[PDB]
Amino acid sequence: TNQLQYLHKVVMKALWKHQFAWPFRQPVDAVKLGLPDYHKIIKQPMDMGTIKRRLENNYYWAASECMQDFNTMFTNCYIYNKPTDDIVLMAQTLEKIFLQKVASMPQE
Amino acid sequence: SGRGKG
Secondary structure: OHHHHHHHHHHHHHHHOOOOOHHHOOOOOOOOOOOOOHHHHOOOOOOHHHHHHHHHOOOOOOHHHHHHHHHHHHHHHHHHOOOOOHHHHHHHHHHHHHHHHHOOOOOO | OOOOOO
């Protein structure tokens, strides 16, 4: 669909290459990052790599389904991390771009 | 409330 094309060619394109994107390009690895409570707190992990694969593989049935996955990724970050953690500011920066681009997405 | 990434 045209909305999913826009989410891939415009939204994901902008977010994937952003200088703050690197912590979000793959699933949170609780072992690598030393976060033994991560999966106790966050029950629906999400990341941009997964979203990008789903767009590439025509996994989504609706634009809002992809938008919900972006939202879950950012919301997980705000719920799990401390308010003062730098990753929170990175997520906020990327979410602002997501919303600005989504404001001009096609309607169908 | 999580340990957090720093």
